[PDB]
Amino acid sequence: MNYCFAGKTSSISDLKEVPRKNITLIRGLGGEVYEGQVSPLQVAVKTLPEVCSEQDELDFLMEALIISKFNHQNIVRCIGVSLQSLPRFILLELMAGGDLKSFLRETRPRPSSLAMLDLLHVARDIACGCQYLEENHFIHRDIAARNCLLTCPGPGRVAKIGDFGMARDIYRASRKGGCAMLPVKWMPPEAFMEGIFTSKTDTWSFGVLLWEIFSLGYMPYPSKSNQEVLEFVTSGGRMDPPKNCPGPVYRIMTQCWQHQPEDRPNFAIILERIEYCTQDPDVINTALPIE
Ligand SMILES: O=S(=O)(O)CCS
Ligand SMILES: O=S(=O)(O)CCS
C-alpha cells in the first residue's frame, strides 16, 4: 500500500515504529483516543479496535501515512506508530486544548478572557494549514471546528488541522459510508450535487468554519436539517452573520460561499483578508456576546 505527497512516495515501512513497551496510556480523551507517554514524550494515542475488519485496518494505516507526510506547524504531528502489536496505535502530537468546537462552547463569555483577536488568530492558524494543503495539491474535504485542535486553552494557543479521515476515505475508496454521514452543512453545491471536490470546496468549508468560530461554537444553519440546508444553499440562501460579528469578517464568509468555485478566494487571499481584519481596530475592539 503506497501514498504520494509532495512528489515523494511512501509505504508502511517509512513510518517510525515505536516499541509497545515504550508506550504507556494515561487517560481516555473521548476508535478511541488516549493521552499517552513514550519513554519523556507526552503524546496522543489513537487506537484501532481489534474487532474491526482488515479493510478498516488498511484505512487506519493510510491515515498514518497521510499525517506523517505533512510538515507544517498548523497540522497535527505524527510522532510515529505501533503497528507490530494489537491493538494498533497511531501516535500524535498531544493537543491539550482539545477540539475547537468544544473549546468555543466551553470558554464563551457567560465573563471570559476570550476576545475577537483570539478568534481571528485561530482562523489565521487554520487558514495557514489550509494554504499549505492547497499549495501541495491536497484536498481536505472535511474542514470543520470538530476537526481542528488546540495546543493549549490559554493565550498562546495554536490551532491545527487534526483529522484526515475523509481525505483518507478517498485514497482507499472507503464503500462503507452513506448519505447521512456526509458533512452536508460544510459542503458547496458542486460537492453535494456532483461529487466535485477541489481546493475551492475547502474554501467553502473554511467559510462555514469561520461562522463556527465567530458564533462561538454553534451548529451551522442552527435551526435547519441537512436536507433543508441543501435546498436553502442551492437556492442562493446563506447564513446570517453570527451575533456581534464584524462586517469585514462576515464578508470573508460570504466570499467563501460564492456559488461558483472560480469566484471564491484561494487560501492566500483568505489569509490576506484575515490579516486586514486583525489590523482594523473597529474589528478587534468588538465585544463578544454573553451567554
Ligand atoms: O470506522 S472505524 O474504522 O473507525 C471502526 C471500525 S471497528
Ligand atoms: O503570516 S503567518 O505567519 O501569520 C501565517 C503563514 S500561513
Give the whole-angstrom CA distance, residue 148 versus residue 270: 18
Domain count, the chain: 2
Instruction: Note whether 128 and 218 are same-domain residues.
Output: yes
Element (H, E) at 117: helix 116-135
Listed residue (130, 119, 104) closest to 219, CA to CA: 104
Domain with residue 78: its CATH number is: 3.30.200.20
Closest alpha carbon to 88 in 48, 45, 54 = 48
Please give the grid coordinates belonging to residue 44. 496522543
| Vertex 64: Cα angle to 157 and 125 (nearest 5) | 25
Q: Are residues 122 and 164 in the same domain?
A: yes
What is the Cα–Cα distance from 63 to 241, expressed in whole angstroms?
A: 35
Which numbered ligand comes closest to the C-alpha of 120? 2
Resolution (Å) of this entry:
2.1
Say if residue 50 is in the same domain as residue 111.
no
Same domain, 86 and 113: no
DSSP class of 286: P
Q: 122 CA to middle of ligand 2, Å?
A: 11
Q: What is the 3-state secondary structure (H, E, C) of 83-115?
A: CCCCCCEEEEECCCCEEHHHHHHHHCCCCCCCC
CATH number for the domain that contains residue 125: 1.10.510.10
Q: Which method was used?
A: X-ray
Known binding site: residues?
46, 93-95, 163
Q: In the sheet that 98-99 helps form, which strands lie side by side, from edge to edge?
A: 98-99, 148-150, 159-161
Residue 81 included in any domain: yes
* Smallest-distance ligand from the CA of 126: 2
Which residues are part of the catalytic machinery? 142
Domain, as residue range, for 79: 1-94
Cα dist from 195 to 186, 192, 267, 278, whole Å: 14, 6, 21, 35
Judge if 125 and 203 occupy the same domain.
yes
| Assigned domain for 43 exists | yes
Phi/psi at 91 (nearest 5 deg)? Answer: -105, 125
Q: Is 266 exposed, middle or buried (0-12, 13-18, 19+ CB in 10 A)?
A: middle
Q: Do the domain assignments include residue 286?
A: no
